[PDB]
Structure 1
Amino acid sequence: GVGHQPYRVVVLSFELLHAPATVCGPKKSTNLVKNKCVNFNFNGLKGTGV
């Protein structure tokens, strides 16, 4: 039957933490701007500041 058919199962587990990251998305980094109120995105951490 359909319910008795075998299936291939892949489980992905992520370590989402405040730790250094080695697996990242395909986003491309830009230059660094200091002493100016800008938006920032550091490894998926988004914010707005200086």
Structure 2
Amino acid sequence: GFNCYFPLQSYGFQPTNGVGYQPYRVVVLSFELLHAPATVCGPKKSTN
């Protein structure tokens, strides 16, 4: 109600609009180095 707002808001994308307000998908990658063995490495070192 009045002064009683639902905390979220919708985006309501429309296609024909300009590029600046168009939906975008973002992926954030994080690297963590604890005092523990590493589990992620780089592949390409093979030779015949």
User: What band does the TM-score fall into relative to the shorter chain?
Assistant: 0.3 to 0.5
Between Structure 1 and Structure 2, whose CA radius of gyration is higher? 2
Q: 1 or 2, which has the higher helix percentage?
A: 2
Q: 1 or 2, which has the higher strand percentage?
A: 1
